[PDB]
Enzyme design. Structure first.
Site, PDB file in Angstrom:
ATOM      1  N   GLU A   1      15.788  38.581 -11.356  1.00  0.00           N
ATOM      2  CA  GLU A   1      16.441  37.885 -10.106  1.00  0.00           C
ATOM      3  C   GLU A   1      15.099  36.591 -10.354  1.00  0.00           C
ATOM      4  O   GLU A   1      15.469  35.586  -9.936  1.00  0.00           O
ATOM      5  CB  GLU A   1      16.383  38.485  -8.897  1.00  0.00           C
ATOM      6  CG  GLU A   1      16.702  37.486  -7.663  1.00  0.00           C
ATOM      7  CD  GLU A   1      17.135  38.196  -6.290  1.00  0.00           C
ATOM      8  OE1 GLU A   1      16.863  39.414  -6.393  1.00  0.00           O
ATOM      9  OE2 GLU A   1      17.519  37.396  -5.689  1.00  0.00           O
TER      10      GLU A   1
ATOM     11  N   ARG B   1      15.100  43.547   4.691  1.00  0.00           N
ATOM     12  CA  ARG B   1      16.090  44.550   4.612  1.00  0.00           C
ATOM     13  C   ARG B   1      15.783  45.789   4.701  1.00  0.00           C
ATOM     14  O   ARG B   1      16.516  46.670   5.398  1.00  0.00           O
ATOM     15  CB  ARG B   1      16.560  44.373   3.286  1.00  0.00           C
ATOM     16  CG  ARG B   1      17.686  45.386   2.790  1.00  0.00           C
ATOM     17  CD  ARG B   1      18.502  44.833   1.465  1.00  0.00           C
ATOM     18  NE  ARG B   1      19.338  43.792   1.403  1.00  0.00           N
ATOM     19  CZ  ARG B   1      20.418  43.542   1.731  1.00  0.00           C
ATOM     20  NH1 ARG B   1      21.157  44.623   2.291  1.00  0.00           N
ATOM     21  NH2 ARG B   1      20.885  42.216   1.748  1.00  0.00           N
TER      22      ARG B   1
ATOM     23  N   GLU C   1      24.601  47.994  -5.221  1.00  0.00           N
ATOM     24  CA  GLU C   1      23.381  48.646  -4.349  1.00  0.00           C
ATOM     25  C   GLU C   1      23.745  49.704  -3.552  1.00  0.00           C
ATOM     26  O   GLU C   1      22.829  50.806  -3.457  1.00  0.00           O
ATOM     27  CB  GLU C   1      22.555  47.560  -3.704  1.00  0.00           C
ATOM     28  CG  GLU C   1      22.163  46.413  -4.612  1.00  0.00           C
ATOM     29  CD  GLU C   1      21.479  45.315  -3.860  1.00  0.00           C
ATOM     30  OE1 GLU C   1      22.209  44.547  -3.281  1.00  0.00           O
ATOM     31  OE2 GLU C   1      20.211  45.330  -3.807  1.00  0.00           O
TER      32      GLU C   1
HETATM   33  N1  LIG Z   1      25.220  47.980 -15.185  1.00  0.00           N
HETATM   34  C1  LIG Z   1      24.445  47.337 -14.190  1.00  0.00           C
HETATM   35  N2  LIG Z   1      24.883  47.648 -12.831  1.00  0.00           N
HETATM   36  C2  LIG Z   1      24.134  46.779 -12.013  1.00  0.00           C
HETATM   37  C3  LIG Z   1      23.115  46.043 -12.134  1.00  0.00           C
HETATM   38  C4  LIG Z   1      22.645  45.913 -13.682  1.00  0.00           C
HETATM   39  O1  LIG Z   1      21.903  45.245 -13.955  1.00  0.00           O
HETATM   40  N3  LIG Z   1      23.379  46.748 -14.612  1.00  0.00           N
HETATM   41  N4  LIG Z   1      22.490  45.534 -11.175  1.00  0.00           N
HETATM   42  C5  LIG Z   1      22.522  46.047  -9.979  1.00  0.00           C
HETATM   43  C6  LIG Z   1      22.062  44.996  -8.867  1.00  0.00           C
HETATM   44  S1  LIG Z   1      20.304  45.142  -8.452  1.00  0.00           S
HETATM   45  C7  LIG Z   1      22.929  44.361  -8.206  1.00  0.00           C
HETATM   46  S2  LIG Z   1      22.135  43.510  -6.786  1.00  0.00           S
HETATM   47  C8  LIG Z   1      24.374  44.157  -8.431  1.00  0.00           C
HETATM   48  C9  LIG Z   1      24.703  42.544  -8.683  1.00  0.00           C
HETATM   49  O2  LIG Z   1      26.014  42.476  -9.267  1.00  0.00           O
HETATM   50  P1  LIG Z   1      27.240  42.172  -8.302  1.00  0.00           P
HETATM   51  O3  LIG Z   1      26.820  41.392  -7.225  1.00  0.00           O
HETATM   52  O4  LIG Z   1      28.184  41.681  -9.181  1.00  0.00           O
HETATM   53  O5  LIG Z   1      27.455  43.792  -7.752  1.00  0.00           O
HETATM   54  O6  LIG Z   1      24.705  44.737  -9.625  1.00  0.00           O
HETATM   55  C10 LIG Z   1      23.971  46.187  -9.406  1.00  0.00           C
HETATM   56  N5  LIG Z   1      24.743  47.036 -10.784  1.00  0.00           N
HETATM   57  O1  LIG Z   2      16.490  36.488  -1.050  1.00  0.00           O
HETATM   58  C1  LIG Z   2      17.027  37.572  -0.998  1.00  0.00           C
HETATM   59  N1  LIG Z   2      17.109  38.203  -2.350  1.00  0.00           N
HETATM   60  C2  LIG Z   2      18.169  39.371  -2.339  1.00  0.00           C
HETATM   61  N2  LIG Z   2      18.753  39.892  -3.116  1.00  0.00           N
HETATM   62  N3  LIG Z   2      19.204  41.128  -2.734  1.00  0.00           N
HETATM   63  C3  LIG Z   2      19.492  41.020  -1.394  1.00  0.00           C
HETATM   64  C4  LIG Z   2      18.696  39.694  -1.155  1.00  0.00           C
HETATM   65  C5  LIG Z   2      18.574  39.207   0.171  1.00  0.00           C
HETATM   66  O2  LIG Z   2      18.883  39.603   1.113  1.00  0.00           O
HETATM   67  N4  LIG Z   2      17.644  37.977   0.225  1.00  0.00           N
HETATM   68  O1  MOS Z   3      19.951  42.560  -5.209  1.00  0.00           O
HETATM   69 MO1  MOS Z   3      20.163  43.256  -7.172  1.00  0.00          MO
HETATM   70  O2  MOS Z   3      19.186  41.718  -7.994  1.00  0.00           O
HETATM   71  S1  MOS Z   3      18.038  44.375  -6.312  1.00  0.00           S
END
Ligand SMILES: Nc1nc2c(c(=O)[nH]1)N[C@H]1C(S)=C(S)[C@@H](COP(=O)(O)O)O[C@H]1N2
Ligand SMILES: O=c1nc2[nH][nH]cc-2c(=O)[nH]1
Ligand code: MOS
Ligand SMILES: Cc1cc2nc3c(=O)[nH]c(=O)nc-3n(C[C@H](O)[C@H](O)[C@H](O)COP(=O)(O)OP(=O)(O)OC[C@H]3O[C@@H](n4cnc5c(N)ncnc54)[C@H](O)[C@@H]3O)c2cc1C
Ligand code: MOS
Ligand code: FES
Ligand code: FES
Ligand SMILES: [Ca+2]
Ligand SMILES: [Ca+2]
EC number: 1.17.1.4
Lengths: 1285, 99, 50, 50
Positions: A763, A841, A1222
């Site tokens: 991120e 959070r 998550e």
């Molecule tokens: N296979 C896979 N699933 C995963 C991830 C990833 O890197 N690989 N990241 C996770 C995280 S940290 C988040 S925030 C979400 C983001 O994707 P979405 O918003 O499309 O669910 O995917 C989740 N599931």
């Molecule tokens: O800055 C943020 N970045 C985030 N990643 N996943 C949740 C988030 C949030 O609330 N705020």
């Molecule tokens: O919000 Mo997932 O990039 S820790």
């Protein structure tokens, strides 16, 4: 130098200038252009680099096939070997192999980066055994890691080789007659007897010996020369320990080093025999010979079960394990305890010696002379009255380094219980394999009885001492294991000489039940169109290409002819002045181009989310791993070697490492965060009971199978640069590269095709690499690239925040909570990054699913000399939820009430306000809870648990059911925004672009499903190529689980504009096709291009007023888990997990169940296996899969059930779905709380009878924490002049 | 761009319409994944028709920034753009023209 | 014409789903894209012309 | 276009054209082309997938 001649996928390779340092992985990827084989670790632990090797066996007259790690295989070992890669078995361009088809159709591929390695493990098994057993299938993967899937779908899909998410009747049967033939040219060369070969590299000479006489001549001429067979030690020494052996002799061809002789005293193996050959011979011996003759053989086999995986056992030699003489060898203690016979030779000499304590005189030495080689090893038959055990305990059962490992042998006088010989040999207790000779010597002529047990335990406690500074630490745990192993041997020997039935299970070797997996989800309505795939289990669109190795990741992009490689130069000090940097040694390394540092930056050296970081350190370093600079060179190996010899001179400053150090020094980022509701003083006044404590939860490394990587391409015009980046955040990559260059943002193009994992790690922290590689492209005017080695990635890029909590909970005798105070402290490291939002959070999740009328939560960010910690799946949620369930678990114990009753009676109801005054609408926890209690048979299984605990002294079971809720939205209101760009081309094909990135979560799949429904056209007509800053600008990071919700709306709105523009043409030609309407629109000059945009409504919480919506809605779920702990070792089984998840009306139940299973297993990792260790000075010890243990295939619950809640549309998101990324991770805590239940049973049994004791269990509950908590007569054996009365 | 200065003219047009200096505007290239279904650059009409399309895209941006301009009339272009972004207003649009 | 730069094309096959990226000296990226797609027999959304 | 750096694995194409205004193609023989060092392949109508 001789030609190196081998085959890859049936094609002859003639390498005229083989360098002995060239690995097969580098050769495949950089010389042959076959990029399906991946680098995940370079140390043999992940299996991403798995290939199949095939050769003609002289000694067996047959073609053999075995798996190998391409990262550790020298190409110089492969003369006349046939390699098969993922590309050699099938492709989407030809036809997929059954293995490829089934892992893709089964939902066994998410990010896809592990998929080729796991495909090649399964393919190799099938080439040896076309109809394997379920146990052979699971054993295939001891050496493969997957971070995404939670392993269940890979095993369930492959079980087919021994509504529904997939249909096995669709699968093409395996047909071994259609496999590619062994290369006929290779089978002809088997006729020509072998010749000595010589390979000459830049630094190393390699002699392939054909005969024993050549080997002994070479060792007489070059005694210093390193032998290499498997390279599974020397490869580690060369890569990770900066060792250079200028001369290597490979004796693997020599028939005498490969011979297997069955003699009257035992079975002799050539020192070059692979451990997999030893294992196959000993298994056949154990099947054929009487039990009493195979005691030592079964000890060897027990160690080999837990010795790495198939890839390493197929190449690792006996002789390599013995002569490496590692303190943690699992075989040397067994060879020492059994007096295994070693035949040693040099030119004109030969001797046989039984291995004993003198064979290993000091660290990594043996009693071989420099001219000697180990020829053969005879493992002895056991005798009458002779018994043997071997035990290994580590951090993880599968593919781990021993904490303690042993061989134990006893010989009785004939027919008696009277000891004639006793040998207890241990690894992991000194700098070499040792024998407890003092202890065992005192038992000669004693009888096998309780007094001998007590005497041996007290002796082992005195003789196997560990000073407080012992390398590896875990002093109390290791000492306990040495006794606990002897106790297991003691009881096992009583049984073999013939026990109270409550003692029997202590003598059982590890056994798993067969797997049971059920997935329940909702069928789509009867009338739904077949072309409407929304709510259908459509596989990930790239799954087939991931399984074939065709899916391109960043480093798979071909290099430009003028492309250079970057290696980061990082701080070796936690906190110091940089006094000087000397590059004079680096400038001497061939292919060196330049050293870059802060002074080379043309724009700004200020970077990071809060502008509190350097691109390159200036004046000061503030963590180990702090980036000072970078070497650029013509090859990655030259960049590495030059970086290693850049000399930095430091002057140490006072360092703040730990949370406690930060609190004591007042070292914090900003001021306290706080949420407070109700009246704490009155709540505590009303309380029957108050419990106060402290709790710690360890950090976590993302272990995305693809590490960070950036390609930067300078265009040479107007500052323009195009970057290919493994990132979740193309927008911050662009603006950070632009700020460092001092150019407008419009000059920088960032392109993200896919990531092999992100999990929050990409991120922000991906910019550390992007900006360094961009500076290198700017300074050189050449393309540059960098992909981090695992050890760099773990050191530099940060992890999950460790949390320390101080809590105080007021409750009634009924278990009802009336007051709660929790002070949270996070270890933030050396910059702000996302630490503030993560603590917000955490504070929003301190309630979990519980109504607490009087509540105060605080948060502090500790500023420390550690790499900056960042987003990790859950983003502060999992820490705060864990702290919640820990005090909840303590309320139920204190009250003497069943934990499920105390949780239920405290649970929010529909319409309740949280502690942050948000209304819970569609609160589905109660339905998930009642359904999970019913389908898990929780009540019936609680009485089976109690029965097992009464019947078992040294094993215990635990059961727990926990709920969760997860707030859905960025806590930063302005990030809740999403853009799309849609083009319809004149053939009617649709190109969708959105702000979101693919990291395996199936976002592009869901967006295609959404566009297909919205437009009413098949998915076949819609394509998403990539994410790019010149299609959708100013994108939020792909984060907070909201991507489907927000990009789904933006795509939906862009589809509606398209529908409105085609409406006049559809009306004028209602019987036309999509293609007719699109061409007619084009010919009428109507635009077939639009943006879509979405802004999540009604968000904006304030910490000052405790008002406004933090979240759009909550995702909910419940998990029930059951474990069995081994009270004597700290190992545990995950017996059964049942999950019920509310994902609203799932857009894709295959991808959503895959997110629930994946998230659950990363949580299981967080709470039970994954631990990062740091020196007191702040230097990370744990920098690869060898020491950082993520969940393995064998780690998952054996019975694994997932249900998606029926009939729960969510009107707050696209087609009634809910975010799933998550929310399920915290449900992994169910295993932790089942482990705690089991430990309470162990402590009731051997520690004390205080049924209301609160023992502190920190996270993670590793074997160390589990064993040490099971206080008994053993932990007790492992003083002040006065005491006040 | 084939030497006729089309990108130059489009930057001059976008600068006039947006009332910002040309120094804040850049054209990198032409691509089928940014503007699909393009007529060939031909018939001397590219300034006329792409100039209209750019003009209309600039009019949408200005309408989106207008509330931020009226809220902070003495602010800079950069203040209005950041205020729009923080308020979750889209700063991406198409333009189109049909003679 | 005697354009001082003669005709030129770079074609980059991505290896996934027929995807190709082309760098072309052309006044007509649209017909370049649809003609390349027609010859390959893939949808036009697979072909990027720059 | 041709100033764009080449990939390390980038190949070069040369068109084979008619020397006749109007004729049947009776045969094509590539047996001499095949002997030129670095020859990769000869492409003709039959290689077109679309
Ligand atoms: N296979 C896979 N699933 C995963 C991830 C990833 O890197 N690989 N990241 C996770 C995280 S940290 C988040 S925030 C979400 C983001 O994707 P979405 O918003 O499309 O669910 O995917 C989740 N599931
Ligand atoms: O800055 C943020 N970045 C985030 N990643 N996943 C949740 C988030 C949030 O609330 N705020
Ligand atoms: O919000 Mo997932 O990039 S820790
Ligand atoms: C991922 C992974 C997991 C592992 N797990 C374990 C484990 O669980 N337990 C464990 O004990 N080990 C483990 N190992 C270590 C390693 O695989 C073993 O030690 C293996 O037996 C080494 O043999 P090799 O042929 O690869 O040795 P090489 O690396 O080829 O050589 C090792 C050493 O032996 C010397 N040598 C080899 N043959 C002879 C000979 N005949 N005479 C004299 N000297 C000789 C070489 O000179 C060198 O010093 C693991 C390694 C990896 C990479
Ligand atoms: O219309 Mo100009 O491309 S002849
Ligand atoms: S890259 Fe070879 S085992 Fe990980
Ligand atoms: S699919 Fe296995 S690591 Fe991502
Ligand atoms: Ca990381
Ligand atoms: Ca931080």
């Amino acid at each position: 130098a001789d030609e190196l001649v081998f085959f890859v996928n049936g094609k002859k390779v003639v390498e005229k200038n083989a360098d002995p340092e060239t690995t097969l992985l580098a050769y495949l990827r950089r010389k042959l252009g076959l990029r399906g084989t991946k680098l995940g670790c370079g140390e043999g632990g992940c299996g991403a680099c798995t290939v199949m090797l095939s050769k003609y066996d002289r000694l067996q007259d047959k073609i053999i096939h075995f798996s190998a790690n391409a990262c550790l295989a020298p190409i110089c070992t492969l003369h006349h070997v046939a390699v098969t890669t993922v590309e050699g078995i099938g492709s989407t361009k030809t036809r997929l192999h059954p293995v490829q088809e089934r892992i893709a159709k089964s939902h066994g591929s998410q990010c896809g980066f592990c998929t080729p390695g796991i495909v090649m493990s399964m393919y190799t098994l099938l080439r040896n055994q076309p109809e394997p057993t379920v146990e052979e299938i699971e054993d295939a993967f001891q050496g493969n890691l997957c971070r995404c899937t939670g392993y269940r779908p890979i095993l369930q899909g492959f079980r087919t080789f021994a509504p529904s998410l997939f249909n096995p009747e669709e699968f093409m049967p395996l047909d071994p007659t259609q496999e590619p033939i062994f290369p006929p040219e290779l089978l002809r060369l088997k006729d020509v007897p072998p010749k000595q070969l010589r390979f000459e590299g830049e630094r190393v000479t390699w002699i392939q010996a054909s005969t024993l006489k050549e080997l002994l001549d070479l060792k007489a001429q070059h005694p210093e020369a390193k032998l290499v067979v498997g390279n599974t030690e020397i490869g580690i020494e060369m890569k990770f320990k900066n060792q250079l052996f200028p001369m290597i002799i490979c004796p693997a061809w020599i028939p005498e080093l490969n011979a297997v002789e069955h003699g009257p005293e035992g079975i002799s193996f050539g020192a070059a025999c692979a451990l997999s050959s030893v294992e196959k011979t000993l298994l056949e011996a154990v099947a054929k010979l009487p039990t009493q003759k195979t005691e030592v053989f079964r000890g060897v086999l027990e160690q080999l079960r837990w010795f790495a995986g198939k890839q390493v056992k197929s190449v690792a030699s006996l002789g390599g394990n013995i002569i490496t003489a590692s303190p943690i060898s699992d075989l040397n203690p067994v060879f020492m305890a059994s007096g295994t016979k070693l035949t040693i030779v040099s030119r004109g000499t030969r001797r046989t010696v039984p291995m004993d304590h003198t064979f290993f005189p000091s660290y990594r030495k043996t009693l071989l002379g420099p001219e000697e080689i180990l020829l053969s090893i005879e493992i002895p038959y056991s005798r009458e009255d002779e018994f043997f055990s071997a035990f290994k305990q580590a951090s993880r059962r599968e593919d781990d380094i021993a904490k303690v490992t042993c061989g134990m042998r006893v010989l009785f006088q004939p027919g008696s219980m009277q000891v004639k010989e006793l040998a207890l040999c241990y690894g992991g207790m000194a700098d070499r394999t040792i024998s407890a000779l003092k202890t065992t010597q005192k038992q000669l002529s004693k009888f096998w009885n309780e007094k001998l047990l007590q005497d041996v335990c007290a002796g082992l406690a005195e003789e196997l001492s560990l000073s407080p500074d012992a390398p590896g630490g875990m002093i109390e745990f290791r000492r306990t294991l040495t006794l606990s192993f002897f106790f297991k041997f003691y009881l096992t020997v009583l049984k073999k000489l013939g026990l109270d039935p409550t003692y029997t299970s202590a003598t059982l070797l590890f056994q798993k039940d067969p797997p049971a997996n059920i997935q329940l989800f909702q069928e789509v309505p009867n009338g739904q169109s077949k072309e409407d795939t929304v709510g259908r289990p459509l596989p990930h669109l790239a799954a087939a290409m991931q399984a074939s190795g065709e899916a391109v990741y960043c480093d798979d992009i071909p290099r430009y002819e003028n492309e250079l490689f970057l290696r980061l130069v990082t701080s070796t000090r936690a906190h110091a002045k940089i006094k000087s940097i000397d590059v004079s040694e680096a400038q001497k390394v061939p292919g060196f181009v330049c050293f870059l540092s802060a002074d080379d930056i043309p724009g700004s050296n200020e970077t990071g989310l809060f502008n509190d970081e350097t691109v390159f350190a200036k004046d000061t370093v503030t963590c180990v791993g702090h980036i000072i600079g970078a070497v650029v060179a013509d090859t990655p190996e030259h960049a590495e070697r030059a970086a290693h010899v850049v000399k930095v001179t430091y002057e140490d400053l006072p360092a703040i490492i730990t949370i406690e150090d930060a609190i004591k020094n007042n070292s914090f980022y900003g001021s306290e965060l706080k949420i407070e509701k109700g009246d704490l003083k009155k709540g505590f006044s009303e309380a029957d009971n108050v419990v106060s404590g402290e709790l710690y939860i360890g950090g976590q490394d993302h272990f995305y199978l693809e590490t960070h990587c950036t390609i930067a391409i300078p265009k040479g015009e107007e500052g323009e640069m195009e970057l290919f980046v493994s990132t979740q955040n193309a927008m911050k990559t662009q603006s950070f590269v632009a700020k460092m260059l001092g150019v407008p943002v419009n000059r920088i193009l960032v392109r993200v095709k896919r990531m092999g994992g992100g999990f929050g790690g990409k991120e922000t922290r991906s910019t550390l690499v992007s900006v360094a590689v961009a500076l290198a492209a700017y300074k050189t005017g050449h393309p540059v690239r960098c992909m981090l080695d695992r050890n760099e990635d773990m050191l530099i890029t940060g992890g999950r925040h460790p949390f320390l909590a101080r809590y105080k909970v007021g409750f009634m005798k009924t278990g009802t909570i009336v007051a709660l105070e929790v002070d949270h402290y996070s270890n933030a490291g050396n910059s702000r990054d996302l630490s503030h939002s993560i603590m917000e959070r955490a504070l929003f999740h301190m309630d979990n699913c519980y109504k607490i009328p009087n509540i105060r939560g605080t948060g502090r960010l500790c500023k420390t000399n550690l790499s900056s910690n960042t987003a990790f799946r859950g983003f502060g949620g999992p820490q705060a939820l864990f702290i919640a369930e820990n005090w909840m678990s303590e309320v139920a114990v204190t009250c003497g009430l069943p934990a499920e009753e105390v949780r239920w009676k405290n649970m929010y109801k529909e319409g309740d306000l949280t502690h942050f005054n948000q209304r819970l609408e569609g609160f589905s926890v109660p339905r998930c809870w009642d359904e999970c209690l019913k389908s898990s048979q929780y009540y019936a299984r609680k009485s089976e648990v109690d029965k097992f605990n009464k019947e078992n002294c040294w094993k215990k079971r635990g059961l727990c059911i926990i709920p969760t809720k997860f707030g859905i939205s960025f806590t930063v209101p302005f990030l809740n925004q999403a853009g799309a760009l849609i083009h319809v081309y004149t053939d009617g094909s649709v190109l969708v672009s959105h702000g979101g990135t693919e990291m395996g979560q199936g976002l592009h799949t869901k967006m295609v499903q959404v566009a297909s429904k919205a437009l009413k056209i098949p998915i076949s007509k819609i394509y998403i190529s990539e994410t790019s800053t010149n299609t959708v600008p100013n994108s939020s990071p792909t984060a907070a689980s909201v991507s489907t919700d927000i990009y789904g709306q933006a795509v939906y709105e862009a589809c509606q504009t398209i529908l409105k523009r085609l409406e006049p043409f559809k009306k004028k030609n209602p019987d036309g096709s999509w293609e007719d309407w699109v061409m007619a629109a084009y010919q009428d000059r109507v635009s077939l291009s639009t943006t879509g945009f979405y802004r999540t409504p009604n968000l904006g919480y304030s910490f000052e007023t405790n008002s406004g919506n933090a979240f759009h809605y909550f995702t909910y779920g419940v998990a029930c888990s059951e474990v069995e702990i081994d009270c004597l070792t700290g190992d545990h089984k995950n017996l059964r997990t049942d999950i019920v998840m509310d994902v609203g009306s799932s857009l894709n139940p295959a991808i959503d169940i895959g997110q629930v299973e994946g998230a659950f297993v990363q949580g299981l990792g967080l709470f039970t296996l994954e631990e990062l260790h740091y020196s007191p000075e702040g230097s990370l010890h744990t920098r690869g899969p060898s020491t950082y243990k993520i969940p393995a295939f064998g780690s998952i619950p054996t019975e694994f059930r997932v249900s998606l809640l029926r009939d729960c549309p969510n009107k707050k998101a696209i087609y009634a779905s809910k975010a799933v990324g998550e929310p399920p991770l915290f449900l992994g805590a169910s295993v932790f709380f089942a482990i705690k239940d089991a430990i309470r049973a162990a402590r009731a049994q051997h520690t004390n009878n205080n049924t209301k004791e609160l023992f502190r269990l920190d996270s993670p509950a590793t074997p160390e924490k589990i064993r040490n908590a099971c206080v008994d007569k053993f932990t007790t054996l492992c003083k002040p002049w006065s005491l006040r009365v």
